[PDB]
mmCIF file of C-alpha atoms and ligand atoms in Angstrom:
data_model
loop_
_atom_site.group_PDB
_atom_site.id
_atom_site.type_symbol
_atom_site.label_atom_id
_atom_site.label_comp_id
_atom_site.label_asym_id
_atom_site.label_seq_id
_atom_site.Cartn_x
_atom_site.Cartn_y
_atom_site.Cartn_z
ATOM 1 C CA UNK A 11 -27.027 35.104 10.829
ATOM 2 C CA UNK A 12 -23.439 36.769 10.095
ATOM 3 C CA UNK A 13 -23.131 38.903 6.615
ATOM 4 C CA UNK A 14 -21.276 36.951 4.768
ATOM 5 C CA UNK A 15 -23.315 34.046 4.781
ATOM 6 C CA UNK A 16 -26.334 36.311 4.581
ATOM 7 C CA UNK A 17 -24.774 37.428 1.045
ATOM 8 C CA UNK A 18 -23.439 34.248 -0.122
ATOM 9 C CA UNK A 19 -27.036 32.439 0.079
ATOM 10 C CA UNK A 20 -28.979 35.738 -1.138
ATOM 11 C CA UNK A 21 -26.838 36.022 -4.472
ATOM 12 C CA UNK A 22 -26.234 32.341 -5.143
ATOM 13 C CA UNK A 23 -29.275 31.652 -7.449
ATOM 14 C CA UNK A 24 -27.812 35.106 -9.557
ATOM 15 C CA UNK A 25 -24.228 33.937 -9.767
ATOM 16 C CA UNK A 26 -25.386 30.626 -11.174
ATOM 17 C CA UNK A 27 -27.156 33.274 -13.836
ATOM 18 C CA UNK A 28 -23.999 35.080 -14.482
ATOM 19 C CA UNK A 29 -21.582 32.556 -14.772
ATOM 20 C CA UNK A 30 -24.685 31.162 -17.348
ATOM 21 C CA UNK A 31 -24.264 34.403 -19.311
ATOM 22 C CA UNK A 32 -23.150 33.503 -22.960
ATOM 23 C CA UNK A 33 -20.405 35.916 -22.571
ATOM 24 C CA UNK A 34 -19.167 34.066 -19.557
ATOM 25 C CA UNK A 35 -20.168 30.695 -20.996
ATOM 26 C CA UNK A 36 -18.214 31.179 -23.927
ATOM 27 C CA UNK A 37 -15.621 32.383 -21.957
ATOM 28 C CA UNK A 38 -15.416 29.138 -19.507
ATOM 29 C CA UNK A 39 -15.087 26.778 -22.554
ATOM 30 C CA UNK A 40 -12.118 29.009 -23.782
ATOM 31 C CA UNK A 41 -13.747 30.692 -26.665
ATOM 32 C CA UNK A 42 -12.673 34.521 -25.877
ATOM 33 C CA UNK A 43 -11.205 36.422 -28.500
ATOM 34 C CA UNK A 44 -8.213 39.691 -27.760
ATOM 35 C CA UNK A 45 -11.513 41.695 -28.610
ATOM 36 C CA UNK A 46 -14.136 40.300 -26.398
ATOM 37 C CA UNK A 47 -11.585 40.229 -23.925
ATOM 38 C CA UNK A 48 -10.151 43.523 -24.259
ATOM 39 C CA UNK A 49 -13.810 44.860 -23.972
ATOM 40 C CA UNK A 50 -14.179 43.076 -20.696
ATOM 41 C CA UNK A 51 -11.519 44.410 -19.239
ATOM 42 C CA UNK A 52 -11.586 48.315 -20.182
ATOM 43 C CA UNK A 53 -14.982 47.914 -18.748
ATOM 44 C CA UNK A 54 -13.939 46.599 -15.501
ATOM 45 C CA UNK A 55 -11.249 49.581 -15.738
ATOM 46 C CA UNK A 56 -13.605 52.067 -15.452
ATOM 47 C CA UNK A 57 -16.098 49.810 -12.569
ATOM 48 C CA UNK A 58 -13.039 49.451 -10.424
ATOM 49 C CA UNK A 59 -12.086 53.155 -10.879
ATOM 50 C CA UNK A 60 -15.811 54.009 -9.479
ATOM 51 C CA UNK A 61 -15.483 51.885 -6.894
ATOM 52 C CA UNK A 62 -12.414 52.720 -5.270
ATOM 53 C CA UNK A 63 -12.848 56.443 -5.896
ATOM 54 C CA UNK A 64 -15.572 55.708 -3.443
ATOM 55 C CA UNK A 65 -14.100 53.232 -1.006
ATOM 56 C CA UNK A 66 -11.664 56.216 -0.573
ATOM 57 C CA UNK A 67 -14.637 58.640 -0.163
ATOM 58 C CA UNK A 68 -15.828 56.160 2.666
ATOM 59 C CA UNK A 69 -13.065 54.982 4.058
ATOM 60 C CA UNK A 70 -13.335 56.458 7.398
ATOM 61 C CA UNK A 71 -17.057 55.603 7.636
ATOM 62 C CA UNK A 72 -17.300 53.057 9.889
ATOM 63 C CA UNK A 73 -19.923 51.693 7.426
ATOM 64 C CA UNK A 74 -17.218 50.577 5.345
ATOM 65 C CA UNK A 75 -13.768 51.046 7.272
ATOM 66 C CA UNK A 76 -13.374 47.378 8.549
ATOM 67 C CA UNK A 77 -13.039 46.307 4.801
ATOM 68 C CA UNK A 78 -10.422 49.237 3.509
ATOM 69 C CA UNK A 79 -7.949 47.147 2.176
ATOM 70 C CA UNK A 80 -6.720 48.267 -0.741
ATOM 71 C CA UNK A 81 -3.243 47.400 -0.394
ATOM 72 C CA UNK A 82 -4.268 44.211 -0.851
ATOM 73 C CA UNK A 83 -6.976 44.247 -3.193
ATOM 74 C CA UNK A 84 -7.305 47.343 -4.533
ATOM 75 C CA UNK A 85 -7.420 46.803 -8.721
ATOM 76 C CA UNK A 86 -7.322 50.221 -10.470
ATOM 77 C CA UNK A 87 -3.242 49.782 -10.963
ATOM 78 C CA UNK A 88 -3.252 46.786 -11.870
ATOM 79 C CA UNK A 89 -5.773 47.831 -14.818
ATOM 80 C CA UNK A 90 -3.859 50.439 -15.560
ATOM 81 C CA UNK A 91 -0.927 47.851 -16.233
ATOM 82 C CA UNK A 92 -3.113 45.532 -18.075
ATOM 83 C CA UNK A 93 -4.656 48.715 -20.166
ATOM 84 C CA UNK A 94 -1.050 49.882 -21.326
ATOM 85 C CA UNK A 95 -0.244 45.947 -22.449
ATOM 86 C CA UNK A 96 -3.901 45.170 -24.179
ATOM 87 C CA UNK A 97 -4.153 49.336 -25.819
ATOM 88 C CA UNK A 98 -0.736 50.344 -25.781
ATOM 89 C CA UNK A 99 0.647 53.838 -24.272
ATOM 90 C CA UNK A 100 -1.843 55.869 -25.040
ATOM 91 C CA UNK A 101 -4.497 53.954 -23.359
ATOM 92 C CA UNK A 102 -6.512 56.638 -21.864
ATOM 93 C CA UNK A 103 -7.561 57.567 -25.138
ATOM 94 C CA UNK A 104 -8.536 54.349 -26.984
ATOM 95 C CA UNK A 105 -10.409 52.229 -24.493
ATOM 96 C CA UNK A 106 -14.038 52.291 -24.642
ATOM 97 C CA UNK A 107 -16.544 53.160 -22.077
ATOM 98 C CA UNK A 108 -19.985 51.395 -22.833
ATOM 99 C CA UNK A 109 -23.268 53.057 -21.900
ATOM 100 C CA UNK A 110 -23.562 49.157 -19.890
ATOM 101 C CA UNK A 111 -20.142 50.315 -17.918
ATOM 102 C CA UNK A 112 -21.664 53.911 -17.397
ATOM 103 C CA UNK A 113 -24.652 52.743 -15.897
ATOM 104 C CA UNK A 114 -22.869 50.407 -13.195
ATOM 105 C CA UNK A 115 -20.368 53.324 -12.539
ATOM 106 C CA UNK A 116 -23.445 55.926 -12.223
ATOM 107 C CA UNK A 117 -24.728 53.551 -9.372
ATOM 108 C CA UNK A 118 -21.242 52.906 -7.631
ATOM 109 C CA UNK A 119 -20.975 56.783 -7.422
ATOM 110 C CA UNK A 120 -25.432 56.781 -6.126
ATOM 111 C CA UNK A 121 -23.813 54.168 -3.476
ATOM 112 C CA UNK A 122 -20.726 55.255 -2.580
ATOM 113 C CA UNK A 123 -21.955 59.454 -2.494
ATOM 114 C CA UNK A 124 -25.644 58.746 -0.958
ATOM 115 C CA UNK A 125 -26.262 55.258 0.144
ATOM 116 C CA UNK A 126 -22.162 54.004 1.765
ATOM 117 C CA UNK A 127 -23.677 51.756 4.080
ATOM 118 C CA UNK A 128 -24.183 49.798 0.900
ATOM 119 C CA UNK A 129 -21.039 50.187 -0.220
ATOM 120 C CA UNK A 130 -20.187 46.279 0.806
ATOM 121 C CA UNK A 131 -22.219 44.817 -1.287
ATOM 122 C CA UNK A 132 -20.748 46.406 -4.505
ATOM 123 C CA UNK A 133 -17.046 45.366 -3.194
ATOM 124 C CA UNK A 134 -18.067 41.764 -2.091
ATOM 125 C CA UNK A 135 -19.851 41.268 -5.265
ATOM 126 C CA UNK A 136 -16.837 42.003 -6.896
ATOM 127 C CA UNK A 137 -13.505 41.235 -4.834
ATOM 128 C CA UNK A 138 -14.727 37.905 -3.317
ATOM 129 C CA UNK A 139 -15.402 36.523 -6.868
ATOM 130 C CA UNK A 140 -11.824 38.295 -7.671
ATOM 131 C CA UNK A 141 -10.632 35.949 -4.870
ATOM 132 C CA UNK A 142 -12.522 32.888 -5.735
ATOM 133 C CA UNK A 143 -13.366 32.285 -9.027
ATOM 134 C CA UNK A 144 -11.610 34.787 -10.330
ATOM 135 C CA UNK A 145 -8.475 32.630 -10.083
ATOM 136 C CA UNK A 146 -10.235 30.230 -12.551
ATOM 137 C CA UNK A 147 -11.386 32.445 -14.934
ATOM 138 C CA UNK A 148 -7.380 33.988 -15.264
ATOM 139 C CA UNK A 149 -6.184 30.402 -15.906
ATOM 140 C CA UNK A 150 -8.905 30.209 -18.910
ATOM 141 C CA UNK A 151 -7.742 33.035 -20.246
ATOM 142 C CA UNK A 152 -4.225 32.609 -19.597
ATOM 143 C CA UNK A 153 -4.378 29.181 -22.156
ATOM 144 C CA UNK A 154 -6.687 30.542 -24.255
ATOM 145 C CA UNK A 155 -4.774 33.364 -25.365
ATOM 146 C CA UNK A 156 -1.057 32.275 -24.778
ATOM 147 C CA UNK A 157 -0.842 34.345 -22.187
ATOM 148 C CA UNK A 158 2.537 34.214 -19.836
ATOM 149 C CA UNK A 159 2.835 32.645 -16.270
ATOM 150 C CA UNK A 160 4.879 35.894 -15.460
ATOM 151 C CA UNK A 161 1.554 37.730 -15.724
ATOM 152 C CA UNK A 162 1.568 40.409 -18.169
ATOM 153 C CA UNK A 163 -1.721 40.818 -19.296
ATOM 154 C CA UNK A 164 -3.267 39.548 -16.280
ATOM 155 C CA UNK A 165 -1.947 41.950 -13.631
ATOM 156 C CA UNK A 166 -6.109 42.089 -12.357
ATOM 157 C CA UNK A 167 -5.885 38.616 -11.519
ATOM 158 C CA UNK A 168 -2.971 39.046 -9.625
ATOM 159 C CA UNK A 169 -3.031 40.257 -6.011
ATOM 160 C CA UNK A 170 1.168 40.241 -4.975
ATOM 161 C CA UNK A 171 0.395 41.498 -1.442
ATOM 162 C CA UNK A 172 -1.869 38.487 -0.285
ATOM 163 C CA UNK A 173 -0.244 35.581 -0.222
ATOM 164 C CA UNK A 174 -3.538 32.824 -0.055
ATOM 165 C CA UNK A 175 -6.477 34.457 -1.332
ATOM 166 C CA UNK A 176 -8.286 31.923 0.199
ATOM 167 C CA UNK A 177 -6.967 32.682 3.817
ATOM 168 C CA UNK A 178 -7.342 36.217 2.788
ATOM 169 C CA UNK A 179 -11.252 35.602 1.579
ATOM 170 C CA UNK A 180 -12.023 34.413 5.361
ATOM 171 C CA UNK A 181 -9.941 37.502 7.091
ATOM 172 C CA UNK A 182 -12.624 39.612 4.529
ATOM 173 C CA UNK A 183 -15.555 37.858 5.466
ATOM 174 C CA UNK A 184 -14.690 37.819 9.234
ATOM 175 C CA UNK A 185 -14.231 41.775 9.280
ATOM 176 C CA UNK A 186 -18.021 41.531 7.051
ATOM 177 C CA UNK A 187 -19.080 39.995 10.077
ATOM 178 C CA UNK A 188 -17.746 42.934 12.070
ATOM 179 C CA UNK A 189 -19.957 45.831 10.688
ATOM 180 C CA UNK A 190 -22.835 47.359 12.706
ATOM 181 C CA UNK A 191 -25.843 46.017 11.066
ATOM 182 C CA UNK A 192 -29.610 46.535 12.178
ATOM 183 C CA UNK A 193 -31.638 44.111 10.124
ATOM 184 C CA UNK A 194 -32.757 46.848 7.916
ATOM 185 C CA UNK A 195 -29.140 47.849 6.619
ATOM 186 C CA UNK A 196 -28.184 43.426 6.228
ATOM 187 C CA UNK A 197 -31.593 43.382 3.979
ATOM 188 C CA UNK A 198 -30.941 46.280 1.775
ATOM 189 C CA UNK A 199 -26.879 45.382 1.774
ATOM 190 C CA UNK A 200 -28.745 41.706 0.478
ATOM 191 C CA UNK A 201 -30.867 43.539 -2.258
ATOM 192 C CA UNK A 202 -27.703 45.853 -3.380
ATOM 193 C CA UNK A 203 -25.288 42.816 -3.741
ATOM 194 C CA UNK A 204 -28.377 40.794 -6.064
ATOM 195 C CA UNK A 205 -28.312 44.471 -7.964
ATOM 196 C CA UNK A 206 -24.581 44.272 -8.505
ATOM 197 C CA UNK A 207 -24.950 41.635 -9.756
ATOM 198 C CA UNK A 208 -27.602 42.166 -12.250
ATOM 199 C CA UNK A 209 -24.828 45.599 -13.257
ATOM 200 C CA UNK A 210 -22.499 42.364 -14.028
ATOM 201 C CA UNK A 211 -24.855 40.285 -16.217
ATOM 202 C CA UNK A 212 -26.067 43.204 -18.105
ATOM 203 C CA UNK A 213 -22.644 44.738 -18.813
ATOM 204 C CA UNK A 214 -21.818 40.969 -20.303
ATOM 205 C CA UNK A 215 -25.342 40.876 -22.263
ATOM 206 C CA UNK A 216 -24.243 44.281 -23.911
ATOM 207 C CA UNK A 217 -20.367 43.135 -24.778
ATOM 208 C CA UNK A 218 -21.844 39.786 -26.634
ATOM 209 C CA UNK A 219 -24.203 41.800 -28.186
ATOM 210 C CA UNK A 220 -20.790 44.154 -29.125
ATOM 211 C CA UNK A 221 -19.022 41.226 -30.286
ATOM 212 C CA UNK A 222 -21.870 39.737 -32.155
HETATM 213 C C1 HEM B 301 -18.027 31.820 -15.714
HETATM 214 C C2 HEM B 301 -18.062 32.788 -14.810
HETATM 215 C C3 HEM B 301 -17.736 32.460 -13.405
HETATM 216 C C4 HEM B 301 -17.165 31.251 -12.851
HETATM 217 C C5 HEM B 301 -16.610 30.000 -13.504
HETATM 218 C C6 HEM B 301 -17.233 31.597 -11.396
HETATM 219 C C7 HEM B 301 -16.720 30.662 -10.448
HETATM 220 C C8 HEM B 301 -16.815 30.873 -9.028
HETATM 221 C C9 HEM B 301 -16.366 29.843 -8.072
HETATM 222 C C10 HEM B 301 -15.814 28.477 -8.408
HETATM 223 C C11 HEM B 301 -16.582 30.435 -6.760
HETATM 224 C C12 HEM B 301 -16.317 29.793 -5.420
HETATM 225 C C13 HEM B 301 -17.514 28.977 -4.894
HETATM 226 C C14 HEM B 301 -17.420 28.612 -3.419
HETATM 227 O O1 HEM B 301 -16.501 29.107 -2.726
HETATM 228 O O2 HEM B 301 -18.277 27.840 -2.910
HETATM 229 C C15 HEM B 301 -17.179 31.768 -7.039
HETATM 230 C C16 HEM B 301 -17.484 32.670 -5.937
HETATM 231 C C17 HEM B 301 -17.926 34.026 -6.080
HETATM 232 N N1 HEM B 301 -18.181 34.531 -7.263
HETATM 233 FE FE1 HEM B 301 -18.077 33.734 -9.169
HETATM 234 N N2 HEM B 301 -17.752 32.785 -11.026
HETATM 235 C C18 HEM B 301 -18.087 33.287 -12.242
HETATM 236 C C19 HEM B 301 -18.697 34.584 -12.513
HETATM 237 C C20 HEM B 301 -18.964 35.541 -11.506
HETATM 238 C C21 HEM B 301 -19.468 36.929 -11.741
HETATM 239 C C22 HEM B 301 -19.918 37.601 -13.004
HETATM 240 C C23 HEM B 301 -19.447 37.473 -10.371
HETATM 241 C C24 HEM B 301 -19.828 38.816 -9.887
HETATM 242 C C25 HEM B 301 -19.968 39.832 -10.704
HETATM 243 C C26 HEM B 301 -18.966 36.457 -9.447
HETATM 244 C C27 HEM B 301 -18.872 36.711 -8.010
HETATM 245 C C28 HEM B 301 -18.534 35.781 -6.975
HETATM 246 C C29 HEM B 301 -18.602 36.174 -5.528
HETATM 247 C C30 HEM B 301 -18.940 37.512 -4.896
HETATM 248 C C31 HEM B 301 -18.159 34.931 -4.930
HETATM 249 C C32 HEM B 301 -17.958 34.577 -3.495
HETATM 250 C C33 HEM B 301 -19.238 33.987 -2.945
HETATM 251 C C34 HEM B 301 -19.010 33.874 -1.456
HETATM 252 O O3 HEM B 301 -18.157 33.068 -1.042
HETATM 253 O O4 HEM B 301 -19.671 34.575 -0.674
HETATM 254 N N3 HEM B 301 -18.528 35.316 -10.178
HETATM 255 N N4 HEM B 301 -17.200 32.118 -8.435
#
């Protein structure tokens, strides 16, 4: 049984939790505020920024290397862009950095420093749901805050060097598929990917609870 199907099936009962979060529920019916919002997306600032200081750690380890992409996908500048527009020029400075973030940034840098043949399931948890549903979730947000088609504001939703993430989502998967895997390393990656996404869900718990 290849990876990627391995992982799809294995975190499909959590993702219908997430996507269930009220955070994310509230969200999909087109409820979120600049604030919620602009919480979500310092957060993801500083989750991306752990996780790609640690792809690049990793990126010769042939535990990772097949899915070193970050040309296409890689989502720190585009945050950066998105953090200038939503907190102005001085960015750095006024963004917050919840203890929710810190704790799924403490375990990218436990991954990525001790455990890197894990690695995969932090960046499938979170680039192939940048890929998939992620393209639904900028449209929401795009009409819910008069947001512009020309994409300021939403750079992280937009990935200029892939053309079809779709067609891009199967090259990923197929290079998953790829990766020396004993079935010891495909359960843990399994259990990892279900903990990412358990990081998710509790970062959201902790910005409604923010908000509210
Ligand atoms: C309201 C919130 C969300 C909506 C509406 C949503 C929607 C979707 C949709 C429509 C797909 C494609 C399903 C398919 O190809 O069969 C998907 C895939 C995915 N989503 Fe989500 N999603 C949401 C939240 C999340 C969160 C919080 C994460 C992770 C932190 C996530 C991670 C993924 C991953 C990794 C995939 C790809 C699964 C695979 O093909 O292996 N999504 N999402």
């Amino acid at each position: 049984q290849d990876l990627s199907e391995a992982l799809k099936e294995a975190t499909k009962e959590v993702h219908i939790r997430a996507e269930n979060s009220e955070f994310m529920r509230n969200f999909q019916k087109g409820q979120v505020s600049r604030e919620g919002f602009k919480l979500v997306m310092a957060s993801l600032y500083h989750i991306y920024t752990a996780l790609e200081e640690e792809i690049e750690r990793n990126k010769q380890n042939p535990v990772y290397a097949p899915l070193y992409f970050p040309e296409e996908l890689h989502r720190r500048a585009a945050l950066e862009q998105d953090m200038a527009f939503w907190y102005g020029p001085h960015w750095q400075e006024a963004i917050p950095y919840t203890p929710a973030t810190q704790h799924y940034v403490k375990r990218l840098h436990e991954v990525g420093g001790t455990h890197p043949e894990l690695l995969v399931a932090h960046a499938y948890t979170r680039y192939l749901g940048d890929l998939s549903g992620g393209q639904v979730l900028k449209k929401i947000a795009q009409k819910a805050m008069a947001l512009p088609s020309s994409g300021e504001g939403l750079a992280f939703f937009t990935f200029p060097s892939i053309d079809n993430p779709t067609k891009f989502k199967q090259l990923y998967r197929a290079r998953m598929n790829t990766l020396e895997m004993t079935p010891e390393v495909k359960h843990r990656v399994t259990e990892e990917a279900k903990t990412a996404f358990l990081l998710n869900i509790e970062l959201f718990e902790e910005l409604q609870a923010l908000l509210t």
